[model samples]
Target: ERWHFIMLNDTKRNTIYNAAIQKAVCLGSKSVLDIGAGTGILSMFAKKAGAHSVYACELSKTMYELACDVVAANKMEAGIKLLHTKSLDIEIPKHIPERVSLVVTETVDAGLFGEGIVESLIHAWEHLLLQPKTKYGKVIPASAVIFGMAVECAEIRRHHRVGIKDIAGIHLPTNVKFQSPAYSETIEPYTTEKMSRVPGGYLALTECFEIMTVDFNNLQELKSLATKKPDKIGIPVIKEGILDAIMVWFVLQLDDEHSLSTSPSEETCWEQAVYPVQDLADYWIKPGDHVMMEVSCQDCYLRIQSISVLGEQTCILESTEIALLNNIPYHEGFKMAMSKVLSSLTPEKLYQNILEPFYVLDVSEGFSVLPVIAGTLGQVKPYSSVEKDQHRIALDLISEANHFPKETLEFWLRMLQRPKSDKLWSIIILDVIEPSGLIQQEIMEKAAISRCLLQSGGKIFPQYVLMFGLLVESQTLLEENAVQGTERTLGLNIAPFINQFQVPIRVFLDLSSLPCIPLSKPVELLRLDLMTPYLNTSNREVKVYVCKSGRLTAIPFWYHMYLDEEIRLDTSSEASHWKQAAVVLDNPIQVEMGEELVLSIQHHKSNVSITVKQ
Candidate 1:
């Protein structure tokens, strides 16, 4: 995997782990067991460190084969044994002749136990290795301590929950059910991000404190704690600010002398785990305020179950899966554009008579506030393709709190609860933007069908879209996909062969955080009208003048959703929920400031290709 390059590039990680393995061997541990041995580096280290026998177990066939090749090429094949099965499935004396004296593994994820290290270590302690209490028996990382702190970051909060009460002119009701609670229980326990690289940065509301300590050497202790109920811990706020998220990192006690910390300030391969406080209103905390947090390692995943602001007596815990459905930035962008489009639906504009009610249909993929915004104007009929119970409940709650008439405003909820009708819709809000900022593959086909179900003078919210591209020179993006150096790779040429698997397009990237030099201004690449679409494939060539002298390594692109004549939603903006995609060139080309490059842009349905002419 390309990510392996990033891990290998971490000089600090390799140096510390190598030193730990050497220390374990020097302490008289003769035999060693390496779990999840991806490339056999640890096995090779153990063998070179004077271990009599080294056994490396890999679960993935691809990784197992790679490890075998790496070990053999390094001339340490005879000293190490390879097992292509799970550590849990390995039977003592069957996989290995005897239990090993040392067990070394780096199976920790951003969340301390996410990679199933606890389970693997427990199994290894019972069956695969000699007892840790013995003179020579040990694990590389003796223990790990996870630390967390309360933070105030609006950039992180905007992506998770709805913070605005008005989008353009449409009013969002002040109902608890429609908004995320202050404390949240998420389907995703934690998300990993380089906290130091956050766009606007973050303010630490509380000093870092111990959340949990996990001993890799203790099997019985781990077994008991994994099943124990989460305990509540109170940490005081050191600053006056709004609480937004909990940021977590860990420190590994590699051996008696060496330790590594994966703090936000540390330059390591691992990112800090972030648990966003999914709240609508501000939960301000002062220097004296104490936050009660329930921390757990149940189900082998480090989780923050609840966060209570003691001063306000606010308990924040709810279904964050639903909160995620109500994406704040995405809805705000759409609602701001939709309000303008819906408010213009007057009798003189489209309808023949003033008495005739307008039927607005929202065929967006999941939960949407479009129909609710349009309901404020007139009659609405919303269509949910996913049809989840929570979506219906959220819609009903919002409509009820807005104080709109049941016959007109609540009609969208009724439409979702019942069967489809033959009534042609006057306005349709089709979901055009995907999560990754890629075009939906079946968008044209869906649009053609939607046209049949629309009234003669009906309109779509995103009637058309414009895709734009910009050339950039980003070494940050390059190093992520390709190996940078060979001197530290044990004199092996791993870059050329490994780089062959690189893809043309990279999606789900935060362009704001990427370090890049923009070589050219954003050029219009493609324009697709959803109302009248006929082609499955199209090509366009445009000359982009380079303004900056740099190598054109990537072509980043975004969409401009033209909802109406005056309102357009730009996804490239800082606050938009949609991530941008880039076409990473296989071979980068250097261009002068005055150079003009001819780019051939091709679009097949929602996918794209960009190549420069010789």
Candidate 2:
């Protein structure tokens, strides 16, 4: 038959393992021995922490095989040896050539005092291994005190509903009395200091003390002490029942070297602890009460026996007589009932519904900002020529603009048509130089002669003057003067003929940035034109250039448009006019070209050109 053991089943067990490992590693232990190594996880931990070697012993054959497989899969077989035998049965010298420096084990039950823990540890010390000349190097003990409120909910006990009237066939509710027993294997460890006067409304008061005088080597006997103070005033009872009391228990190890032992005594290594509340009866409690109690331990068993009262000579309850009558200690039964109550409250459901969902929302807030902007920019491009030009120059600019439409100029024009204060102002202008009627050779000569006349302060030709007026706006005069100044300094003259009429240059100004306009009419557009020569032949291609500037800038570039067909100037007019034409020849031009030029004039701040071939 195999004896099974589970290791590190809860937080308490993990805490014990960590502390023990730290103590062993600090002691300069080269090799470690683990008793009842259920899954051998602890042995693996020791190896990872730089131990030279580890030996794990398990009494259960099934667990031993599983542990060996786990160690083998982890590739730790070279450093760990798994023995499928009990700690008592294994001959240390036969299996291991060198003595182990540390032995670590965690075999504590909930109540602190349990069977097999002390006896097995003591026997292991006498028959198996112990470090000599070491006062406390053999074992190290770990312990904890858990706290909770006590209530008499229906789930606490099966006999809580038993009626005293039914059992006796008489209305003797006042005669029926209840008391608790001291049959618990676990004891509540505490200390008591006398007070001059007990305070009111206090159900129970307790203090913890460490009793370190007990010796681990002499396991023959152990004792602990605890004091209890009950409430001085009693709650008025509509129904008779016991008030709540605080319960405490201690767990300790024998060898400060590797094992721990604790109980409700003054000499135990663990501190006195308490678990407080009213008796599991559904009742109310009030102030001014007195409680007096005693707790002790014998061998491996513990007992908590005491009497409490609401006032002087009240005799409200008795725990010692109850323990003797029920063949169980008061604290032991209370602990069992408390454990069941806590388990039903199962924390797993709370984590799934409340705690875990909050963590997911916190993670999403950090990762969702940049992807949204990139997606919006991809959808608004490819609809306009100016937009395409701007996008090709820098996709980053469009994304940075907060996803505004590329056709904002057209939208502004539509807003202006409304006769309300919400009007917008928009315009567009193109600069062009047309050639006159002459052979290619004569045309160049004529252009040079005309420019020479204009630079010499001679009157310019009317055709050239008209051509310049179409391209340069009146506002451009200031800009053209600056250009002429630079040209004169550089000794260059590239104007139309001096004999031609005075030319006018056109320029567009964006008035939106100026605050001079009244709030009622907040937007405006201004245009000026430049005078230049016009091309004679309708079939000749005209080169149109486009440019952009704002928070960022792009240089002007050209695209070609040629005549394709002739159409009437309007549907109502019978006269033929150069109304429609087709575009031919395409090199790498950023703007589209055709016979029908759709000049989309946006706000004074923007412009676009679209050509459709018929």
On TM-score, the candidate that comes out on top is 1
lDDT of 1 by residue, 1-614 (tens): 75677776565667778888898898898888999888877888788888998999999898888777767776787989999988999997778999888998888788778889988988988888776673546787899989999998877766556565666335655654343332344457777878877877899999999998888888778798868888899999899998888999999998778998879987543588888775434488898888788888776688886677665122222323333333555555555554454456553432155545566667667656666666554444444343656656556666666555554443343322112465566667777877676888778766777777666666776888899989999986777777666554544444544565676788887788777999999999888888777643388888999999998889998999887766677877766667788888878898999988999878877677788976
Task: Give the distance in Å from residue 407's predicted Cα in candidate 2 to where it truly belongs.
Answer: 99
Query: Residues 256-366, candidate 2, lDDT per residue (tens digit)?
Result: 444333332323123223322223233343334334334344445233334343430111222322211222221222223222322333323221123211000000111
* Backbone clash numbers for all candidates listed: 2, 84
Question: What's the residue-level lDDT of 539 in candidate 2?
Answer: 26
TM-score of 2: 0.34
Best by lDDT: 1
**What's the TM-score of every candidate structure?**
0.89, 0.34
Error of 1 at 187 (Å): 2.8
What is the C-alpha local distance difference test score of candidate 2? 0.32
The candidate 1 region of ten consecutive residues with least summed lDDT is 312-321
